[PDB]
Design a protein around this ligand. Structure first.
Ligand code: CDL
Ligand code: CDL
Ligand code: PLX
Ligand code: PLX
Ligand code: PLX
Ligand code: PEE
Ligand code: 8Q1
Lengths: 128, 459, 107, 88, 178, 40
């Protein structure tokens, strides 16, 4: 017996210790076959487009354009106001502002009060 | 001043009667000649100003911005010379006409001894920019970007007109000299609060302030190259110049009306610096960097101390030059790649070494490296804000670290690494692009020798 | 469905024209070699040679209108006079008290 | 660096030198075209051990997918030459 | 790197890979040669004792505790060859590999030097130009309907034919271009 | 490599009777090209 390796979000389970590929069924083999098939189809298309002597440009990648469009220009049309989204927006967009305002207001009030009492020793503070 | 305004006007008939294959040469030569004439304005005196006449006056705040505005136009022409090759003669002449009109409006704006004339030209600077963005733009989102840029500005600036005419009705004059000499305190009242908001919001929307910056990434991304540089270099400084001119009548209300804007800017600098880290686009990244720097300038202006004003002016000039250079480099990359994506083209330093050097220098300058004027303005604002409150140093240091991080990320992703295999149209860089980068960067390293020329009137 | 699947009549998207292929030494300015070369010449001459150097020297040698040396000399004379006569250097009141009139409170 | 430009005959000599010190196989019977599973009767684990020995001796490591399908000294020499870009 | 992969790894391949990794990490643990040989022989002995097992359920039951034991004693700082994907000089020279097509952008003054090299370059370009036209048709007629199932490419079958998609494998820059 | 310009699909947005079509105005028809209606 040996201590077990407990995976986490930032330290994933190794492939060797994973149990999915030890419980092998014919449908799993079929799935791996289809995955390799589509991957090889994409690879063949790319290689056909890549070794062409006539081509003198950049091979357009549909995956990259799709990723960029999803990241940038498709966020709002799929956005819906929900309690989770609304709460997260209110918190992350309002809380820091008021927190910093309170901190700076308190600090400046304390400094001004000390100035009014005159017990601050502002000697040599010429530049401001 | 007319020795500057008149030649800029004569640039239009000069362009329109030029031969079909010699417009660029004439425009560039005479724009450079005009810049030399503008150099004379830099010799300011410790006294009031160079009051040329009843309509135009020049200060040591207007002089650096005027010189930068006159210097930018040749660079805009050299940048636009590339993608306008297949354009008809009439449309190229119209493009040069729009650029010349923009320069003329900016020149008349920056002096503008009267505030209503300043506002009129400040809104006049909006038409040629909108035409440039919506006409000579590549993407299909240029229309929405133009609408956003128009309406965000106009909604903020419309109450400013009412505030100005009200001030003229009560005070009796809007001449800046009379306004400065006859200034009186603003009592703490709701009417005075709304006057403050009306007079401030019009300039804060254009800077832009965090929360009203949504128009800037769109306008910078969808615009052509020349529109991008004129937006990032000069058009952003209009708000700060107006704010530093107009805060002379808002005292002592500002002493407590600056809190929302100070908090918004000091948090939005961090937010946009963080946003720059996770970006799939180059022009968007540069636009967000500009937003961060302008937020720092907003903080400096709202602090209202001599060191704040000096640092604000220095940062204005430095950021203008740096952002123009970065947009130039991004455009040169996009012209060969035709994609405008950061990770699509990699390892370009192996193929284009000199452009890699220009990228490194621009990133270092953006990184606020000493003794460049970027860090001079940065450090002046940091010290002034520290005097304002000792806790601001945390936010400013966080901003500095994130700025370094995203600048070097931009450099590394596009320059270092292994080149992309399926791109074989990376032709060697032309002399035009190298000259453009050199003319962008050399003035910065030259101004670092004579900082007093860009430190503003409170030097 | 006998539709042509063509939405409209359009030219094919033209391919980018390399400026080096038809003209080495291309300078990236114009496709006409003579106009291109002269554009490069005037840009380099008026940008680097005329503005960036002559203007830099002109700004370097600008006359001192800000009155820095004048202020130094005035401060030197003031300090010498006040040290020689035992005056306390800088004065706390910017404006003399006699000229100023303060409204009486009597509260 | 001062590394000599190793050539095909040098690679073959080194391969045969490593193999001849593997006492499971007799030096006289082995040839450059000899097999491993059939002509020499070696186990799969034995072949892995030979591959690791050449790995250690040549200073570069062979990926498993390419190491598991090398069965003759000649094709091992060819693989090493292709890796190291040898002309002749 | 050269050979195309299969959709899955057989039990034999898993056992062989585990054996290689275990021997490598044992060598890393046992610095000296005699100790390494002794413990490698011991590991081979403990590795071949289940060589002749017949049922696959028990064999799959094994090679699981074996992997767990390997993960427990894996020497968290193993030895990596300098050119390996973890080595000290993995991608050291990847900044010196300039693509071949860059030579098409050279100035004629630069091409004046090395004339014979550029003549051979034109010959190679013509060869590629004809070979591509032949290869596209050969690959089109050879692939099964519905798309390829594995990324293995066929060799050249006729006399004057060349292997399909050869230009970017033949014209790799070098191992150490500079 | 080409500046985007509106196509037929983009132009059809302004071809309706009014902008922002709704359920009530879905059955409205654009006026005839010449301002003449059939005599019926
Ligand atoms: C300037 C710098 C940056 C600053 C800018 C950025 C930040 C500021 C702006 C953004 C943040 C402002 C958002 C605040 C108001 C917006 C909410 C809104 O528009 O409603 C649309 C949206 C429209 O409603 P709907 O589409 O008919 O129903 C969809 C839901 O599935 C139906 O949901 P449900 O019925 O299952 O549950 C709703 C229910 C349950 O609420 C909860 O689950 C938890 C309670 C949370 C609120 C109370 C605390 O809510 C309540 O009963 C509480 C009422 C008070 O309403 C919601 O979905 C959210 C409801 C909860 C409101 C939370 C807002 C509170 C935020 C703090 C103030
Ligand atoms: C240290 C002082 C040296 C003084 C000697 C005079 C040097 C005058 C340079 C003026 C500015 C350079 C112009 C910028 C573009 C360069 C043109 C170019 O393409 O290069 C190709 C050219 C030919 O190479 P290639 O093989 O054909 O091209 C292959 C690739 O380009 C591959 O290129 P690469 O791999 O060879 O790299 C290019 C190289 C060159 O590219 C650059 O990055 C140069 C720009 C560096 C500045 C970065 C911005 C930060 C703000 C600094 C502003 C200071 C300016 C002061 C006034 C400048 C007047 C114009 O980049 C670097 O080596 C890294 C630079 C990072 C240095 C960080 C230290 C900065 C602060 C040091 C103290 C400065 C104040 C001292 C105060 C106390 C002492 C008195 O190479 C050069 O010309 C190298 C020039 C020497 C590098 C100077 C770097 C430090 C000097 C800065 C200004 C001097 C301050 C005055 C002190 C005097 C005592
Ligand atoms: C060894 C020397 C080293 C230093 C060299 C310094 C050279 C500096 C040259 C650059 C000058 C910058 C331009 C300055 C323009 C501002 C001043 C200008 O507006 O003044 C005008 C006068 O300008 C001059 O007359 C013309 C100068 C224009 C040309 C400058 C020299 C370089 C020109 C290069 C052009 C291209 C050369 C050829 C290329 C092929 C009008 O003066 P005015 O308001 O009445 O003066 C009233 C006061 N008065 C009565 C005492 C006179
Ligand atoms: C969203 C992106 C950024 C956009 C711009 C943001 C900046 C706008 C924020 C406006 C700045 C402050 C506004 C008012 C400041 C005055 C201080 C006041 O708020 O505090 C208390 C005032 O009490 C209450 O606040 C009264 C006002 C309450 C109603 C105002 C709306 C509050 C929430 C609305 C937020 C919406 C902002 C965005 C609109 C689109 C003090 O009470 P009191 O000492 O007796 O009165 C002081 C004024 N006196 C001396 C002249 C009499
Ligand atoms: C390629 C490898 C290197 C080759 C180069 C080797 C040579 C090394 C030299 C490079 C830097 C070394 C440092 C040497 C500095 C000495 C010169 C310096 O001292 O002069 C400065 C003067 O330089 C100028 O002030 C700075 C240039 C002016 C900036 C204007 C930019 C040009 C216009 C272009 C448009 C601007 C766009 C932005 C508008 C704001 C400082 O002036 P100052 O110490 O006080 O006294 C001058 C003399 N006085 C006493 C008579 C007054
Ligand atoms: C990017 C979008 C930004 C939108 C900016 C819009 C908000 C700008 C701030 C308010 C604008 C209107 C202010 C009015 C112009 C100033 C004129 C003035 O100061 O005169 C006041 C008049 O003050 C007013 O009339 C103000 C009325 C405001 C009505 C319109 C309300 C608009 C929205 C108010 C809230 C917005 C504030 C925050 C906006 C944040 C940005 C979204 C003095 O009144 P007297 O008649 O002289 O009285 C003296 C005798 N006792
Ligand atoms: C320091 C780190 C220590 C790590 C320790 C690791 C654990 C060591 C103990 C491992 C336990 C086992 O053997 S797990 C045993 C796994 N099950 C089997 O081996 C059944 C049949 N084996 C085969 O068929 C193979 O192909 C074979 C015949 C071996 C070769 O064949 P070749 O003819 O093609 O060479």
């Amino acid at each position: 017996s040996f201590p077990k390796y407990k995976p986490s979000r930032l330290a994933t389970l190794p492939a060797t210790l994973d149990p999915a590929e030890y419980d092998i069924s014919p449908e799993t083999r079929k799935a791996q076959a289809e995955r390799l098939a589509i991957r090889s189809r994409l690879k063949r298309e790319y290689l056909l487009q890549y070794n062409d002597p006539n081509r003198l440009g950049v091979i357009e990648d549909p995956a990259l354009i799709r990723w960029t469009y999803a990241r940038s220009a498709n966020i709002y049309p799929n956005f819906r106001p929900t309690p989770k989204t609304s709460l997260l927006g209110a918190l992350f967009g309002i809380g820091p502002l008021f927190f910093w305002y309170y901190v700076f207001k308190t600090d400046r009030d304390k400094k001004e009060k000390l100035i009014q009492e005159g017990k601050l020793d502002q000697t040599f503070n010429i530049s401001y | 001043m007319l020795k500057i305004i008149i030649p800029t006007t004569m640039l239009l008939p000069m362009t329109w009667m030029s031969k079909h294959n010699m417009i660029w040469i004439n425009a560039t030569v005479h724009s450079l000649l005009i810049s030399l004439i503008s150099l004379s304005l830099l010799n300011q005196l410790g006294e009031n100003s160079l009051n040329f006449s009843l309509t135009f006056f020049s200060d040591s705040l207007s002089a650096p911005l005027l010189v930068l505005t006159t210097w930018l136009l040749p660079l805009m022409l050299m940048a636009s010379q590339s993608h306008l090759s297949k354009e008809t003669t009439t449309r190229k002449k119209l493009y040069i006409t729009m650029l010349i009109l923009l320069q003329l409006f900016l020149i008349m704006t920056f002096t503008a001894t009267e505030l209503i004339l300043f506002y009129i030209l400040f809104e006049a600077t909006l038409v040629p920019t909108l035409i440039i963005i919506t006409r000579w733009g590549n993407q299909t989102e240029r229309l929405n970007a133009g609408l956003y840029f128009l309406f965000y500005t106009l909604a903020g600036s419309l109450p400013l007109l009412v505030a100005l005419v009200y001030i003229q009705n009560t005070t009796g004059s809007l001449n800046f000299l009379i306004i400065h000499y006859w200034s009186h305190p603003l009592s703490n009242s709701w009417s005075n609060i709304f006057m403050w908001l009306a007079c401030i919001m019009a300039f804060m929307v254009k800077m832009p302030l965090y929360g009203l910056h949504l128009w800037l990434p769109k306008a910078h991304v969808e615009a052509p190259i020349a529109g991008s540089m004129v937006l990032a270099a000069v058009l952003l400084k209009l708000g700060g110049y107006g704010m530093m001119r107009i805060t002379t009548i808002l005292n002592p209300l500002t002493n407590y009306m600056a809190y929302p804007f100070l908090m918004l800017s000091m948090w939005g600098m961090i937010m946009t610096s963080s946003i720059c880290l996770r970006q799939t686009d180059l022009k968007s990244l540069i636009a967000y960097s500009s937003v961060s720097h302008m937020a720092l300038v907003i903080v400096a202006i709202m602090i209202q101390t001599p060191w704040s004003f000096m640092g604000a002016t220095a940062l204005m000039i430095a950021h203008g030059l740096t952002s123009s250079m970065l947009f130039c480099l991004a455009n040169t990359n996009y012209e060969r790649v035709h994609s405008r994506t950061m990770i699509l083209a990699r390892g370009l330093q192996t193929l284009l070494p000199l452009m890699a050097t220009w990228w490194l220098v621009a990133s270092l300058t953006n990184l606020a490296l000493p003794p460049s004027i970027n860090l001079i303005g940065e450090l002046f604002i940091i010290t002034a804000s520290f005097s304002w409150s000792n806790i601001t140093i945390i936010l400013m240091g966080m901003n500095m670290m994130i700025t370094a991080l995203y600048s070097l990320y931009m450099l590394i992703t596009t320059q270092r690494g292994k080149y992309t295999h399926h791109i074989n149209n990376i032709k060697p860089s032309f002399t035009r692009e190298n000259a453009l980068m050199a003319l962008h960067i050399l003035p910065l390293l030259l101004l670092t020798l004579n900082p007093k020329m860009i430190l503003g009137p409170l030097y | 469905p006998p539709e042509p699947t063509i939405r409209l009549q359009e030219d094919p998207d033209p391919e980018d024209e390399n400026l080096y292929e038809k003209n080495p030494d291309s300078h990236g300015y114009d496709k006409d070699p003579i106009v291109d070369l002269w554009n490069m010449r005037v840009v380099f001459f008026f940008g680097f040679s005329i503005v960036l150097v002559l203007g830099s020297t002109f700004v370097a040698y600008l006359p001192d209108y800000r009155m820095q040396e004048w202020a130094r000399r005035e401060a030197e004379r003031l300090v010498k006079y006040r040290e020689a006569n035992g005056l306390p250097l800088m004065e706390s009141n910017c404006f003399d008290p006699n000229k100023i009139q303060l409204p009486e409170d009597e509260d | 660096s001062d590394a000599p430009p190793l050539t095909l005959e040098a690679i073959k000599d080194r391969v045969l030198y490593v193999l001849k010190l593997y006492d499971k196989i007799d030096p006289e019977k082995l040839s450059v075209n000899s097999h491993f599973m059939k002509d020499l009767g070696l186990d799969s684990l034995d072949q892995v051990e030979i591959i690791m020995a050449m790995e250690d001796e040549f200073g570069f490591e062979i990926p498993d997918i390419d190491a598991e399908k090398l069965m003759c000294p000649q094709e091992i020499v060819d693989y090493i030459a292709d890796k190291k870009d040898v002309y002749e | 790197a050269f050979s195309a992969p299969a959709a899955y790894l057989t039990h034999q391949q898993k056992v062989l890979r585990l054996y290689k990794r275990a021997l490598r990490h044992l060598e890393s643990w046992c610095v000296h040669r005699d100790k390494y040989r002794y413990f490698a022989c011991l590991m081979r002995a403990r590795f071949d004792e289940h060589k002749n097992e017949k049922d696959m359920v028990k064999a799959t039951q094994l090679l699981r505790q074996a992997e767990e034991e390997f993960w427990y004693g894996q020497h968290p700082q193993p030895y990596i060859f300098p050119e390996s994907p973890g080595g000290t000089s993995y991608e050291r020279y990847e900044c010196y590999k300039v693509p071949e097509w860059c030579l098409d952008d050279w100035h004629p003054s630069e091409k004046a030097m090395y004339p014979d090299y550029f003549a051979k370059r034109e010959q190679w370009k013509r060869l590629r130009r004809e070979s591509w036209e032949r290869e596209v048709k050969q690959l089109q007629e050879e692939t099964p309907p519905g798309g390829p199932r594995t990324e293995a490419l066929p060799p050249a079958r006729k006399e004057g034919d060349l292997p399909p998609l050869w230009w970017h494998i033949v014209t790799r820059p070098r191992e150490r271009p500079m | 490599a080409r500046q985007w310009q509106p196509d037929v699909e983009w132009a059809e947005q302004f071809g309706g009777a009014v902008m922002y079509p709704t359920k009530e105005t879905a059955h409205w028809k654009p006026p005839p090209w010449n301002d003449v209606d059939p005599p019926k």
